[model samples]
Target: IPREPRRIVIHRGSTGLGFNIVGGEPGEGIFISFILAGGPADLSGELRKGDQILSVNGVDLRNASHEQAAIALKNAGQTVTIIAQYKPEEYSRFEA
Candidate 1:
């Protein structure tokens, strides 16, 4: 089923958040490779594997590279607000 973009707030712990990611380059936005059990993202109950991250906090990830996306997510402070959506054959693009 196609899912709409969701607003999720994940509170990270002292260590990194509990989800792995891949992609982030143009035409292949960042994807949640996997979500570790008991992690903040997992507990959020809104995130899912394969979901593409549109933005973290106020940073736009529309064209961010892998390194850029990683830093954005890491520096998003303790409580991070993520905008994410599942990929579709032709999904709508986010507005600036």
Candidate 2:
């Protein structure tokens, strides 16, 4: 039984943005829709959208919700170490 969203989101760069709750029992552990331009996530190189938050400041996200993640990110200091898995982009990089 999932509760209503708490209106909080973790800005994981420009890819990890939008309305989404943590993954469900059978779904992925975490999920993201999009990221805002020039957002905190954009500046945090350690964080990315598809990257599942393995832990925050050493806290595991095995059962953490979106709101919890948001709070962690919001309160994160100038150098919050965040671990994330970067997903391969759909298109190849342009050298031009």
Candidate 3:
């Protein structure tokens, strides 16, 4: 299981998750590159800059590709529940 499957509800029209993420290696995990200030992720306080997304709405994504993960997030509707691991090593670096 993920470190802690914390759930957050994002209201309508807000940037979903408000973070940019990248694909992880097979069996590794999806990485959260950055969080948008004042966005859902920043406001929720559950997500971090280097958190690894293990699943979305209970769907495991440890082996998912960037586009596959993106599609899952896109289909998550108004209420988005994300399961992630808070480990620095699991997250890959980006321009952020």
List the global CA lDDT of all models.
0.76, 0.44, 0.73
Best prediction by TM-score: 1
- Model 1, TM vs. native: 0.82
Q: Write the per-residue lDDT of candidate 3 for residues 1-96, one digit (tens) a residue.
A: 246655555543556668888774466567888888988888877788777777888878878878889889889877777877776765744333
Q: lDDT winner among the candidates? A: 1
For residues 1-88, what per-residue lDDT tens digits would candidate 2 score against the true structure?
Answer: 1122222224444433322324433223444434445665554433444445555556555456656676765566444455454432
Q: Which stretches of candidate 2 lie over 4 Å from their true place?
A: 1-28, 44-46, 87-96
Better of 1 and 3 by lDDT: 1
lDDT by residue (tens digit), candidate 1, 7-75: 889988754678876764565577777788888887778887778888999788867787889989888
> In candidate 2, how many Å is residue 36 off?
2.1
Regarding TM-score, does 1 or 3 come out ahead? 1
Deviation (Å) of 27 in candidate 2? 8.3
Candidate 3 TM-score versus the reference: 0.79
Worst 10 residues of 3 by lDDT: 5-14
Residue pairs in candidate 3 whose N, alpha carbon or C atoms collide under 3 angstroms: none
